[PDB]
């Protein structure tokens, strides 16, 4: 039947279709989440256990969106204990001073970093999708 190469290409087409399906589902779930909630589009510091992330919903796509660290992924403020008021306050400082460099789960993060965020664990995008 097909050569190993044709099957490999079939799997990259399948990854594209899967990522598209996942992005659309998460967009729709965002609209459903943002139905009756003010400040949904405003940055909040969220505790992921090991780190804080300043995040909100994107207004166009309704996808999760975080304050970005340079040209990499979301700025994850490493916590040194279960309760780390300093890390949380630095996250607040990020909201105040660094909020114009942002990164969004999905096709944006795919173009920018080579992964969508939704098919790797642990990752803030996947962790929100499990909530």
């Amino acid at each position: 039947e097909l050569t190993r190469y044709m099957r490999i290409k079939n799997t990259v087409n399948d990854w594209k279709s899967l990522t598209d399906s996942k992005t659309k589902l998460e967009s729709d779930r965002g609209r459903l989440l943002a139905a009756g909630k003010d400040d949904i589009f405003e940055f909040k510091c969220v505790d992921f256990g090991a780190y804080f992330i300043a995040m909100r919903l994107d207004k166009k796509t309704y996808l999760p969106q975080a304050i970005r660290r340079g040209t990499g992924d979301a700025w994850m403020v490493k916590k040194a204990a279960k309760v780390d008021p300093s890390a949380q306050q630095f996250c607040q400082y990020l909201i105040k001073h660094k909020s114009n460099n942002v990164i969004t789960c999905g096709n944006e993060m795919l173009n920018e970093l080579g992964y969508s965020g939704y098919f790797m664990s642990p990752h803030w995008c996947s962790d929100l999708s499990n909530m």
Binding site: R69, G70, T71, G72, D73, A74, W75, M76, V77, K78, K79, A80, A81, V83, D84, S86, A87, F90, L113, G114, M120, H123
Partner: peptide, 18 residues
């Protein structure tokens, strides 16, 4: 592994004692 831009400084990276 998440992409990490280490050109951007963050004191929280190294301090392990809370």
């Amino acid at each position: 592994t998440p992409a990490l831009d280490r050109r951007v400084q963050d004191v929280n990276d190294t301090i392990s004692d809370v």
